[PDB]
Design an enzyme around this catalytic site. Sequence first.
Site, mmCIF file in Angstrom:
data_model
loop_
_atom_site.group_PDB
_atom_site.id
_atom_site.type_symbol
_atom_site.label_atom_id
_atom_site.label_comp_id
_atom_site.label_asym_id
_atom_site.label_seq_id
_atom_site.Cartn_x
_atom_site.Cartn_y
_atom_site.Cartn_z
ATOM 1 N N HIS A 60 -0.147 -6.834 76.656
ATOM 2 C CA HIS A 60 0.477 -6.593 75.599
ATOM 3 C C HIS A 60 0.286 -7.459 74.497
ATOM 4 O O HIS A 60 -0.102 -7.023 73.157
ATOM 5 C CB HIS A 60 1.998 -6.498 75.742
ATOM 6 C CG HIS A 60 2.886 -6.560 74.530
ATOM 7 N ND1 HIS A 60 3.083 -5.336 73.829
ATOM 8 C CD2 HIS A 60 3.830 -7.362 74.052
ATOM 9 C CE1 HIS A 60 3.966 -5.758 72.868
ATOM 10 N NE2 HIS A 60 4.363 -7.080 73.093
ATOM 11 N N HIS A 118 -0.559 -7.172 70.050
ATOM 12 C CA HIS A 118 -0.272 -8.105 68.898
ATOM 13 C C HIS A 118 -1.547 -8.773 68.219
ATOM 14 O O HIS A 118 -1.801 -8.843 66.975
ATOM 15 C CB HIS A 118 0.462 -9.303 69.461
ATOM 16 C CG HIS A 118 1.952 -9.185 69.716
ATOM 17 N ND1 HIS A 118 2.700 -8.873 68.683
ATOM 18 C CD2 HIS A 118 2.666 -8.940 70.918
ATOM 19 C CE1 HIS A 118 3.972 -8.601 69.099
ATOM 20 N NE2 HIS A 118 3.932 -8.877 70.432
ATOM 21 N N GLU A 173 6.598 -4.889 66.509
ATOM 22 C CA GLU A 173 6.830 -4.336 68.041
ATOM 23 C C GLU A 173 6.561 -2.826 68.139
ATOM 24 O O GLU A 173 5.730 -2.364 68.926
ATOM 25 C CB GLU A 173 8.023 -4.681 68.660
ATOM 26 C CG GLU A 173 7.850 -5.019 70.096
ATOM 27 C CD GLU A 173 6.689 -6.270 70.175
ATOM 28 O OE1 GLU A 173 7.304 -7.293 70.461
ATOM 29 O OE2 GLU A 173 5.768 -5.845 70.466
ATOM 30 N N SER A 218 0.119 -1.309 73.193
ATOM 31 C CA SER A 218 -0.170 -1.776 74.771
ATOM 32 C C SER A 218 0.375 -0.793 75.721
ATOM 33 O O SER A 218 0.173 -1.055 77.057
ATOM 34 C CB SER A 218 0.466 -3.023 74.833
ATOM 35 O OG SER A 218 1.709 -3.270 74.848
HETATM 36 C C1 LIG Z 1 11.144 -11.626 68.219
HETATM 37 C C2 LIG Z 1 12.406 -10.989 68.577
HETATM 38 O O1 LIG Z 1 13.427 -12.089 68.449
HETATM 39 C C3 LIG Z 1 12.360 -10.744 70.311
HETATM 40 O O2 LIG Z 1 13.388 -10.546 70.908
HETATM 41 C C4 LIG Z 1 11.650 -11.807 70.961
HETATM 42 N N1 LIG Z 1 10.330 -11.553 71.296
HETATM 43 C C5 LIG Z 1 9.833 -12.274 72.062
HETATM 44 C C6 LIG Z 1 10.379 -13.373 72.681
HETATM 45 N N2 LIG Z 1 9.627 -14.255 73.432
HETATM 46 C C7 LIG Z 1 8.216 -14.138 73.782
HETATM 47 N N3 LIG Z 1 7.781 -14.932 74.613
HETATM 48 N N4 LIG Z 1 7.543 -13.103 73.486
HETATM 49 C C8 LIG Z 1 8.270 -12.237 72.366
HETATM 50 O O3 LIG Z 1 7.550 -11.108 72.065
HETATM 51 N N5 LIG Z 1 11.610 -13.686 72.297
HETATM 52 C C9 LIG Z 1 11.965 -13.149 71.208
HETATM 53 C C1 LIG Z 2 8.246 -5.540 73.953
HETATM 54 C C2 LIG Z 2 6.931 -5.480 74.687
HETATM 55 C C3 LIG Z 2 7.024 -4.133 75.362
HETATM 56 C C4 LIG Z 2 5.945 -3.882 76.386
HETATM 57 C C5 LIG Z 2 5.383 -2.445 76.341
HETATM 58 N N1 LIG Z 2 6.172 -1.374 76.613
HETATM 59 C C6 LIG Z 2 4.012 -2.334 77.474
HETATM 60 O O1 LIG Z 2 4.038 -1.588 78.473
HETATM 61 O O2 LIG Z 2 3.091 -2.952 76.903
HETATM 62 FE FE LIG Z 3 5.463 -8.115 71.583
#
Ligand SMILES: C[C@H](O)[C@H](O)C1=Nc2c(nc(N)[nH]c2=O)NC1
Ligand SMILES: CCCC[C@H](N)C(=O)O
Ligand SMILES: [Fe+3]
Lengths: 390, 385
Positions: free
Chosen positions: B245, B250, B290, B309
């Site tokens: 992912h 990203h 996302e 992803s």
């Molecule tokens: C960004 C948003 O607050 C979302 O709930 C979050 N995503 C992530 C997170 N923590 C990690 N490691 N990765 C994410 O994508 N904590 C918060």
């Molecule tokens: C917020 C991350 C979600 C992950 C995504 N549904 C995946 O299968 O890669």
């Molecule tokens: Fe993410």
Amino acid sequence: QSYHSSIFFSISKGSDKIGGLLEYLEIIKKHNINITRIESRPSKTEKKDYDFFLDLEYPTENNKEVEKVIKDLEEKGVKATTLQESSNQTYAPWFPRKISDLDLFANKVLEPGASDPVYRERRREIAKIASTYKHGDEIPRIDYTEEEIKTWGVVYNRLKELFPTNACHQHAYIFPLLEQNCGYSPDNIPQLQDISNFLQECTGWRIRPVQGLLSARDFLNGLAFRVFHATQYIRHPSVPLYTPEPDCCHELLGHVPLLADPDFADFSQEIGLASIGASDEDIQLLSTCYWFTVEFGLCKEGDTIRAYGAGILSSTGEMEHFLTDKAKKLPFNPFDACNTEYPITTFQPLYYVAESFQKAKEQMRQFADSFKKPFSIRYNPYTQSIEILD
Amino acid sequence: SYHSSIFFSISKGSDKIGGLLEYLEIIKKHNINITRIESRPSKTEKKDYDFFLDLEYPTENNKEVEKVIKDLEEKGVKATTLQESSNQTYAPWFPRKISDLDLFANKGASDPVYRERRREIAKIASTYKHGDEIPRIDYTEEEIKTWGVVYNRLKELFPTNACHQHAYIFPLLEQNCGYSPDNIPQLQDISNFLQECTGWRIRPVQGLLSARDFLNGLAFRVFHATQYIRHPSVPLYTPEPDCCHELLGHVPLLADPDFADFSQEIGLASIGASDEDIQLLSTCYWFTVEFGLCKEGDTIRAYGAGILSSTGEMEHFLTDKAKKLPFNPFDACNTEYPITTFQPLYYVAESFQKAKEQMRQFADSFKKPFSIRYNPYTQSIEILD
Ligand SMILES: C[C@H](O)[C@H](O)C1=Nc2c(nc(N)[nH]c2=O)NC1
Ligand SMILES: CCCC[C@H](N)C(=O)O
Ligand SMILES: [Fe+3]
Ligand SMILES: O=S(=O)(O)CCN1CCN(CCS(=O)(=O)O)CC1
Ligand SMILES: O=S(=O)(O)CCN1CCN(CCS(=O)(=O)O)CC1
Ligand SMILES: C[C@H](O)[C@H](O)C1=Nc2c(nc(N)[nH]c2=O)NC1
Ligand SMILES: CCCC[C@H](N)C(=O)O
Ligand SMILES: [Fe+3]
């Protein structure tokens, strides 16, 4: 001594040339001794293009092999631009492209003197530190001796007295921050790591320890990245009021406080950027401009004349001299202060007064424009890289 | 441990500076919860000095900070205090420089083998400090297999389903970061490449961070990424973020300058923002970074990392049961969403520069004591009034 070349070209996403171009690149990357790096990046001028960078090192100036690489590329259907370190003018002058490329300077140091065989093992100890230093390292700290600290004390105490009446106001504004945050004090020599950290947070300037004197080109090229090369050794015990070398006293008391001023920080970088890709003749013009500004520049504050030049601020002697009619003053003009000769082992007989660092920056930008250059360049603070523009 | 910060200015040539300096020296020597005191040139008023005092306590809302305040104002300055608190006695604390992100490291497999392997991979992002090389993972034959299965599956959907930024950058990941179905790319390698593109950096992360911490990280163009990979049996869709992912979803967008600006803007909005605004931002994050879609002429394509992803999400969005809306943060910010199923609703953005402007307009109303701004030259948060 090695000579650096760099080859540049672009290609569009979805060129059917790309697969064949990658194959050629893999081949030379394995079979060409002189290839040090091959990289591709999003183009910074056309949204749809890829940019490609080849970096070569040759042991001899002007090696035919670069021609062979050029011919081979421009036959995979690619238009290649070549930059080279050379006293010859077939190619435009090479420069470092990213801040970590400054490591390529770490060996090249040009420059007698106070012969006192005891300082010798220090210098080696101190200087080895700089040739070992690479970007991303913490600058090593130096246990200075009782003797050295006391040399610092003499120079520091004699200087700090004249600063209010003789130093431009940016110096007096910043200097107490150096005491509060960087340990500036007669009783202690400040460490370059602490100072580098302070400067990064003020203006994004940073320090690299340097073995000694770089070439003009290399030193000015560093400024384009807001990187200041500084020495960690101190002037000999008995030269407090004026020394030849650039000891840490000159670096720390002369150069550092102005670099924490945003406008001066910009002006300084502008000189750096002007040097990127500049001809040898223009590098010399620039080093003269650097002398008459960064090193022995004056400012005018109301009806008063005061000093911002590091060479002045670090020497209690030169501080006395510029304030008297024993020297002449002229307005800074880069197109003027270029055909101007200067003594290096005496006080200056002639200074230039800058109106302000913002106009000095603009004045230097125009000076740069006058330079024959095969492209424009631009600094990117996010990627800390030079971007070439045609 | 709960962090506080105390802010104040004082003009050059003040009567009080001398005394103030002495007190500061003393409480530094004689209060253990004082982590740091520093002074800087003012980014707002030329002849002024900015002072920063960082304090750290074991219990929430420590009475000791309030004593520091009054003691600091007896010496003649007006102080503004920020704090990590569930209360609003003070405005929310934020990290001020990129190294302060160090402070965040404090925070479908019933297989005991997998739970072990997670622990190992994890016991490493908790040890990483800014300035380090990101330590590399010796991935496993099985892990390398899972990646290959996910990578090759997604490789065939990208050209037709991903936005053009993805298709533009991906072959650069192949040529510079060793992207391949045959090996998992390392974060250090990824971070360097991102840095030279848009100035974005990667930190490894042990697990999930708070919304606030994670979003605060983006204000410095720092992305927190997991290094573990999903269980072998969950290649099409997993509710949790894993390395596939991060790296396939990203990373590629983060090399696009406009997207990179956009993502930083969301982080800047989050700096010092109240808890309920953090929540809005979080949702806006979800429906863009996302799970966002883009319009490319006649067709809709995916740029959201959650979609890119997941071959399962990737097939889903293009169908007609999934509703599509024009991206608008005032509409999106309030919209509920599932985190363990495919998205029933997607938001369609026109362009990342626009989405950036919108987020800035959105954020403009956010209540804060200070005006927040990023200095790229100094890599830190400038505070204004
Ligand atoms: C960004 C948003 O607050 C979302 O709930 C979050 N995503 C992530 C997170 N923590 C990690 N490691 N990765 C994410 O994508 N904590 C918060
Ligand atoms: C917020 C991350 C979600 C992950 C995504 N549904 C995946 O299968 O890669
Ligand atoms: Fe993410
Ligand atoms: O040192 S600080 O970080 O405080 C400000 C540094 N920053 C450098 C770049 N200039 C304008 C660039 S240009 O407009 O001349 O191209 C704005 C000020
Ligand atoms: O990503 S790169 O490092 O290549 C260049 C990104 N850079 C970031 C800052 N924005 C300012 C426009 S605005 O957001 O202030 O409107 C210009 C683009
Ligand atoms: C800047 C100008 O080119 C001048 O000749 C130089 N000064 C310096 C230098 N090298 C160092 N380390 N410090 C200087 O001030 N080399 C060149
Ligand atoms: C080259 C810098 C000159 C330094 C100055 N002459 C001094 O006495 O410190
Ligand atoms: Fe100097």
